[PDB]
Amino acid sequence: SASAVYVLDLKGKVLICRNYRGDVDMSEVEHFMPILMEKEEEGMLSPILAHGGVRFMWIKHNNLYLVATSKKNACVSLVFSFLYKVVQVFSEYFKELEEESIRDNFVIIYELLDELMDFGYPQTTDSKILQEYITQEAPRPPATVTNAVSWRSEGIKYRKNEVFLDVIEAVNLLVSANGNVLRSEIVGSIKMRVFLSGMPELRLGLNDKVLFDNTGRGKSKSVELEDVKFHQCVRLSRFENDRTISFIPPDGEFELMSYRLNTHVKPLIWIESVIEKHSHSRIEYMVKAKSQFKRRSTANNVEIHIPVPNDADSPKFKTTVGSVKWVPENSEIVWSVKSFPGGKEYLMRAHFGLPSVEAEDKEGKPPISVKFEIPYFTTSGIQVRYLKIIEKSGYQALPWVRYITQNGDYQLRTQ
């Protein structure tokens, strides 16, 4: 139940404001900046502020803070979801989210803001559907918004019927400084870019552990997805009844399902790093990277960030394979490797200087984060089985999909 959705800037100027209820004075935004400054300088800054009886719940964008005032006990989660939908719409309409578009796209921004939410209740958020009634370059609204299917416009015709899938893996690892891994979760993400003719009803089928157990095939390699979050197109009743994944894909690239399950297997990359930090004299970086992944897979663009001293200078890198660059902006040793064959082992021996005078305040120990991205490798073992493309007109679809394995929260706690 937001009161006024506004767009701020990095200096406190309200780039654009659009009140939906009028229950909050338009001059209350002037106190948001001083309140945020007071909160950030005392450690009490929060995305949801409070100006007397008025709360300012907002998120931080690339260059603007999407603040939305409210007064009653509105659903803060609803406000956050509306802000996220607005950010996604802005990203879909404008390729960049900066001040260069707020002062230049006011003609369409006001229309989008007016159409998106009325009286504090958003009603339309489909960027592909919204692109048919509000344009920056108007006919009656499409029947898709009034119709039940509000994510697939009817009458779409293409010369071919190509659906490209993207099974992107997310390897998140939380390795403590003692050498054990605490949080090792794998978050699957099936992102497809559908290009079909008509309103096809895709019937996705994978090698799910629950599906295999129900069929009676609970003995082969089946992914044990603890959490499966389907898109709005996926029918919840069909999935709940017998694990039937039936949904009409939209036109373009979108996130169909987002799997999330834990993993009890050894890490793909083992990072044995040591720190021979002499007191104000020098330091050594005995970093060893052991690839526990399969030797048949190659991790393209391996980037193991090694946080070196913030005041380190005159650095030297004695490594084995891969370029080693020290970035003073990020204050870390960027162990960049282009191609790392599975089972490979690269050894590096860093050595940098240190000022004689000690620092005034502590600097902390940022965790070492690898940036491995191994294509054509599914760690969870989930394999797509079938995709029932059904159309009333009748056509022969050509489904396609690729598996990409990358690093998620692949951090390693330092000593």
């Binding site: 393209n300 294509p375 054509y376 079938y386 690729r402």
Partner: peptide, 18 residues
Amino acid sequence: DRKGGSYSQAAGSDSAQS
């Protein structure tokens, strides 16, 4: 070609389960 693994064709349904 494409970085992250070559795209592969998918089936239509579980042909082995009718």
